Structure 1
Amino acid sequence: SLQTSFVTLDEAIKITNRRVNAIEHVIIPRIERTLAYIITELDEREREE
């Protein structure tokens, strides 16, 4: 059971860490770049007004 429990755990850790890594390295950076893009473009519209 120890070994079998350790089995279901090594896969669960790698799967959870992979999802966490993607949020940190893919999804949020992309949200931050989008937000910074929006902020810049909004100031550009303010200027022409």
Structure 2
Amino acid sequence: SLQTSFVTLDEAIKITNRRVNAIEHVIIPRIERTLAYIITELDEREREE
């Protein structure tokens, strides 16, 4: 019983770790850069007026 649980829990940990890693090294920088660009554009538009 112990060994069965171990063998399945290994791949469970692997998929969870892959998900958290992909989340922390793909989407967050992308959103942050988009927000930087948005702030810049808003500033431009106000200054023209």
Q: What interval of TM-score do these two structures reach, taking the shorter chain for normalisation?
A: 0.7 to 0.9
Aligned Cα root-mean-square deviation (Å): 1.0
Q: Hey, what's the Cα distance between the residues in 1 that align with 2:32 and 2:5?
A: 39
Structure 1, unaligned runs of 5 or more: none
The TM-score normalised by the length of structure 2 is 0.85
- Deviation string 1:6-46 (CA, Å, 9 cap, x unpaired) is 11111111111111011110011111111111111111111
Aligned length: 49
Q: Hey, what's the Cα distance between the residues in 2 that align with 1:7 and 1:13?
A: 10
Q: Percent identity?
A: 100
1:17 counterpart = 2:29: no
- Quote how far apart the aligned CAs of 1:3 are: 1.5
Once superposed, which parts of structure 1, at least 4 consecutive aligned residues long, lie more than 3 Å away?
none
Structure 2, unaligned runs of 5 or more: none
The TM-score normalised by the length of structure 1 is 0.85
